[PDB]
């Protein structure tokens, strides 16, 4: 029950953080490219 | 392309957040049932 | 049209997820009152 | 009131899954438009 | 510009929702520790 | 800790609602601009 729950919570949390970092880097690139 | 690639990033974030949200719902129903 | 339409799709998804989040907060507050 | 809560959870979950499906379809369309 | 600015806003919303999700997980873990 | 959790839920919820409001204003502007 809860052991698996805590594992899944940590797995998706780690994924989200990775995706948020990648998205912030893409945001930064898109905003820079705006001025080209 | 940079905008579309960013949309792909945000969509995947929202999808992963939805999985997390369904895990929190499962957790609350488990505790509701106990109480 | 497709990029701006995809912005609207993601905005609606975040809005729906915010409704779900308010519901999980209500549920936790209901348990909290009882359990402590 | 938990029954009502479950019903609102079900309803918004269905809404967001529909929105995610439309979003995936639109993401595919936008990517193919750019490639093609 | 309006599209890139909009993506920054959607990114900020998702990030704030992630904060909320971690708060809901902390609360469920607290309640679970008090019950089981 | 619970009194603090309740205040942090409130703080992030307020932020998300302001970002969602700005995002909707931007959606509206981007769609109008597309048409012109």
PDB file of N, CA and C in Angstrom, chain F residues 6-19:
ATOM      1  N   UNK F   6      -1.231  25.451   6.433  1.00  0.00           N
ATOM      2  CA  UNK F   6      -2.440  26.154   5.996  1.00  0.00           C
ATOM      3  C   UNK F   6      -2.093  27.519   5.381  1.00  0.00           C
ATOM      4  N   UNK F   7      -1.171  28.238   6.005  1.00  0.00           N
ATOM      5  CA  UNK F   7      -0.770  29.519   5.405  1.00  0.00           C
ATOM      6  C   UNK F   7      -0.025  29.350   4.066  1.00  0.00           C
ATOM      7  N   UNK F   8       0.763  28.294   3.919  1.00  0.00           N
ATOM      8  CA  UNK F   8       1.507  28.109   2.658  1.00  0.00           C
ATOM      9  C   UNK F   8       0.555  27.685   1.554  1.00  0.00           C
ATOM     10  N   UNK F   9      -0.389  26.792   1.844  1.00  0.00           N
ATOM     11  CA  UNK F   9      -1.463  26.497   0.899  1.00  0.00           C
ATOM     12  C   UNK F   9      -2.094  27.819   0.453  1.00  0.00           C
ATOM     13  N   UNK F  10      -2.422  28.717   1.385  1.00  0.00           N
ATOM     14  CA  UNK F  10      -3.130  29.955   1.011  1.00  0.00           C
ATOM     15  C   UNK F  10      -2.249  30.806   0.109  1.00  0.00           C
ATOM     16  N   UNK F  11      -1.007  30.996   0.521  1.00  0.00           N
ATOM     17  CA  UNK F  11      -0.070  31.806  -0.258  1.00  0.00           C
ATOM     18  C   UNK F  11       0.066  31.286  -1.698  1.00  0.00           C
ATOM     19  N   UNK F  12       0.331  29.989  -1.876  1.00  0.00           N
ATOM     20  CA  UNK F  12       0.510  29.461  -3.247  1.00  0.00           C
ATOM     21  C   UNK F  12      -0.789  29.457  -4.020  1.00  0.00           C
ATOM     22  N   UNK F  13      -1.901  29.215  -3.346  1.00  0.00           N
ATOM     23  CA  UNK F  13      -3.162  29.258  -4.058  1.00  0.00           C
ATOM     24  C   UNK F  13      -3.408  30.668  -4.597  1.00  0.00           C
ATOM     25  N   UNK F  14      -3.135  31.680  -3.788  1.00  0.00           N
ATOM     26  CA  UNK F  14      -3.364  33.053  -4.270  1.00  0.00           C
ATOM     27  C   UNK F  14      -2.490  33.380  -5.498  1.00  0.00           C
ATOM     28  N   UNK F  15      -1.246  32.977  -5.410  1.00  0.00           N
ATOM     29  CA  UNK F  15      -0.308  33.172  -6.524  1.00  0.00           C
ATOM     30  C   UNK F  15      -0.824  32.506  -7.791  1.00  0.00           C
ATOM     31  N   UNK F  16      -1.275  31.256  -7.680  1.00  0.00           N
ATOM     32  CA  UNK F  16      -1.697  30.542  -8.883  1.00  0.00           C
ATOM     33  C   UNK F  16      -2.890  31.204  -9.504  1.00  0.00           C
ATOM     34  N   UNK F  17      -3.831  31.651  -8.679  1.00  0.00           N
ATOM     35  CA  UNK F  17      -4.980  32.333  -9.214  1.00  0.00           C
ATOM     36  C   UNK F  17      -4.595  33.651  -9.893  1.00  0.00           C
ATOM     37  N   UNK F  18      -3.604  34.377  -9.386  1.00  0.00           N
ATOM     38  CA  UNK F  18      -3.176  35.599 -10.091  1.00  0.00           C
ATOM     39  C   UNK F  18      -2.487  35.224 -11.411  1.00  0.00           C
ATOM     40  N   UNK F  19      -1.657  34.186 -11.398  1.00  0.00           N
ATOM     41  CA  UNK F  19      -0.956  33.819 -12.649  1.00  0.00           C
ATOM     42  C   UNK F  19      -2.006  33.350 -13.664  1.00  0.00           C
TER      43      UNK F  19
END
